[PDB]
Symmetry: C3
Subunit: 243 residues, 3 copies
């Protein structure tokens, strides 16, 4: 079966589940194509009103693979950007992050309208751990959703934070036990799905307008800086040591 599956939960709530065990829900060709396909099925089905995006087991999304980053050091690829994919969805998305989220994987979840974290799992914007600056409008999104101070610490350090540590820090999102994350997202989705679809779509467009306006320039600015900081002598070795 496909590594990304769409299921119906009732009342217009649907669940898109990522299960690429081989990459631990990394940004693999299978995951990218599966997400694109599942979101296209959603766009086509006018009865759907809320999407819950979730992972499998211990992983929500581990983002770009270390093998991919190494390939990048030899200038062999370009930078993947899934923002368009998620941001194009016209109905509300809840990211039920029941497992770990790293790098673009944390951003993937934070692109959503609502986010649920697991107490026991680990979250990081770890670009700076490898020694280079973020991509994907990380600072725009993280500052908007997490608050400027938490965003800044996470981005500068690149460190791994448990959900429980983030909660203690005053993150504005629910942080619950791993076994409760998806259930929490589902209950919230059902509350939201009580509204007419037309109203949900209109409201989401209204609420997203300010960030969407700022997004293309943010992505561009971060890419330009990333190209400079990634292409420095010591980066290849730093990436080697994170294996």
């Amino acid at each position: 079966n496909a590594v990304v599956q769409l299921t119906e939960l009732g009342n217009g709530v649907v669940q898109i589940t990522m299960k690429d065990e081989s990459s631990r829900n990394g940004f693999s060709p299978s995951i990218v194509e599966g997400l694109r396909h599942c979101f296209s099925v959603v766009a086509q089905n006018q009865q759907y009103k809320v999407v819950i995006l979730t992972g499998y087991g211990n992983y929500f999304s581990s983002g770009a693979s270390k093998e991919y980053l190494i390939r990048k050091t030899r200038g062999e690829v370009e930078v993947l950007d899934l923002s368009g994919l998620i941001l194009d969805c016209e109905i509300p998305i809840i990211a039920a992050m029941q497992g770990h989220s790293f790098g673009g994987g944390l951003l993937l979840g934070l692109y959503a309208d609502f986010v649920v974290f697991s107490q026991e799992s680990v979250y990081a914007t770890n670009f700076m751990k490898y020694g280079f600056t973020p991509v994907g409008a990380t600072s725009l999104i993280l500052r908007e959703k997490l608050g400027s101070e938490l965003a800044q610490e996470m981005i500068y350090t690149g460190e791994n934070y448990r959900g429980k540590e983030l909660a203690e820090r005053g993150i504005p999102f629910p942080v619950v036990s791993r076994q409760d994350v998806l259930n929490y997202a589902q209950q919230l989705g059902q509350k939201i799905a009580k509204s007419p679809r037309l109203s949900l779509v209109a409201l989401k467009q209204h609420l997203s307008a300010d960030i969407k306006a700022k997004f293309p320039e943010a992505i561009k600015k971060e890419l330009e800086i990333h190209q400079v900081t990634f292409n420095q002598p010591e980066i290849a070795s730093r990436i080697q040591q994170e294996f």
Copy 2:
């Protein structure tokens, strides 16, 4: 006596109390005219430095009446907007929300410079409960004052939140026992009233400038979307069932 009364608390602190029991401090002609009158008396009395706006009993403001909304479905009225009224006041306002606040009633309080919530009372931006989008620059104000995440949940769900639940959620305002709300507002007003009036007025103008700049466009945008989402087939029936 008038349903809206102004009393002096000393040192330039005044209290405007809404007590329209018949409408439960809804946006009745009596409440609108009483607020306009009390704020005009305030504008004229240069010795006043801080206004505390409060309700009576279990209600701060229940906003627009369900009978009014039904009338609206038959296109019989226009949309009331009290923002100009509150935002024109040149001295600081503290909304002592000792009781429930719904819809425009919660916005009325959130237009103020400082807000105090009751632990036991219920608060909602419930437009989406009836199935249509907000008016009154709800998303501008709620996102600015409550933070984007709480604002988003409240707006999308339209649900009733107890003050205690909001406090647990990390709302940036004081949430205290119902019997302590007005006393808390009064003590804060007295602290603020220690400054010269000229300084209070100058500071308030400075601090309010950014939001006031964004307000006319926000009100307009929300009205346009509200007109579309309100005038859909199923709305009349949804309103009927909220009685």
Copy 3:
């Protein structure tokens, strides 16, 4: 010895310590010249990656002296502005506020990229206590870093808040025991210093861009209002009574 001293902590982390006991780390000529000198030494040493700015004993910075304010009432001076000095530093700064911070002294710390507060010490933007409006882009910075609601209360009241009270209020920064403040800042500095300097500088420039864009107009606007509110009949007497 000089009242402002730079020491190396290892791995590119340096500490700038203010110790003007005579003024309690006020904005004295010695402190201003010492800060300028220590930041110039930092700018010149490309091996440095993080600055920790701290005070001595019970004081981080007491800001402008009351004797200076009195001199100002007779129109005898101009307004000191250390923002340029701190904001010009191209590497990340952590303000380890182990002691009290007042007025410009609190702003001095809040200009930094990261801030650590002491539980037992007192913090105030106390301009309004003397009866006039702030300078130094206080409302821009405080609203951005502390959140709009806490910022507003602090600015309007001008009152002294213990670190513990701020923590209870949900300030987005660490608040720890006085004896732990500098150690906490040092550990954070060491985490940040793991990144290449080029990346730290590029990231800081990116993250600071939005506020830096708004800063010159904010400083100007606040100065203009301050000139009006400071030069009112009763201010001299209010300043006299704060001695």
